[PDB]
């Protein structure tokens, strides 16, 4: 049914404004991964976008240089922001580089 969330989220690359995350794609994906991101310790409001699990990767752009960010991935059947979710979320912490 709805694809499980990755066992680990890999930070592949990081520029002062961008973050690149990767995961082994599942064999037969269904439906979406909701990628949520925000500044660790709620200085800013949390942002999101949905991505098919099969893409194996996603780029988080427009970030502030040198700040610690938390990325949470949710397995979802429906992409609208008010849907429920499947399985458990997976979180990662990443500090972006300075200018």
């Amino acid at each position: 049914g709805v694809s499980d969330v990755p066992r680990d989220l890999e930070v592949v690359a990081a520029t002062p404004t961008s973050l690149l995350i990767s995961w082994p794609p599942p064999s037969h994906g269904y439906g979406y991964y909701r990628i949520t991101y925000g500044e660790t310790g709620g200085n800013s409001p949390v942002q999101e976008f949905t991505v098919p699990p099969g893409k194996g990767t996603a780029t988080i752009s427009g970030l502030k240089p040198g700040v610690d960010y938390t990325i949470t991935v949710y397995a979802v059947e429906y992409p609208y922001k008010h849907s429920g979710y499947y399985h458990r979320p997976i979180s990662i912490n990443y500090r972006t580089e300075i200018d």
Binding site: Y78, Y80, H82, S83, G84
Partner: protein
């Protein structure tokens, strides 16, 4: 005089389908009479309408597929309490 109601969240609105709700103190056959009357009046003005459902037992009224241009006309119909534009619901 009857009121028009719609969804405050604009992307959830479904214009073109309306629930015409009638006053509780009416006859059972009054829902069908008003639906038929709305259809006749709209046809005179060159508008096609479809009656999707007639409500009994829950609340008195009907479900109509018509142009929003006819709401002014529809709000003037006797026994009408209010008219609601259909909207979306979602699994939570």
């Amino acid at each position: 005089t009857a009121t028009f109601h719609r969804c405050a969240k604009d992307p959830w609105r479904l214009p073109g389908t309306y629930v015409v709700v009638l006053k509780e103190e009416t006859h059972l056959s009054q829902s069908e009479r008003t639906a038929r009357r709305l259809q006749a009046q709209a046809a005179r003005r060159g508008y096609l309408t479809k009656i999707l459902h007639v409500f009994h037992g829950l609340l008195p009224g009907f479900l109509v597929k018509m142009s929003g241009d006819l709401l002014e006309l529809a709000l003037k119909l006797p026994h009408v309490d209010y008219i609601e534009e259909d909207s979306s619901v979602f699994a939570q």
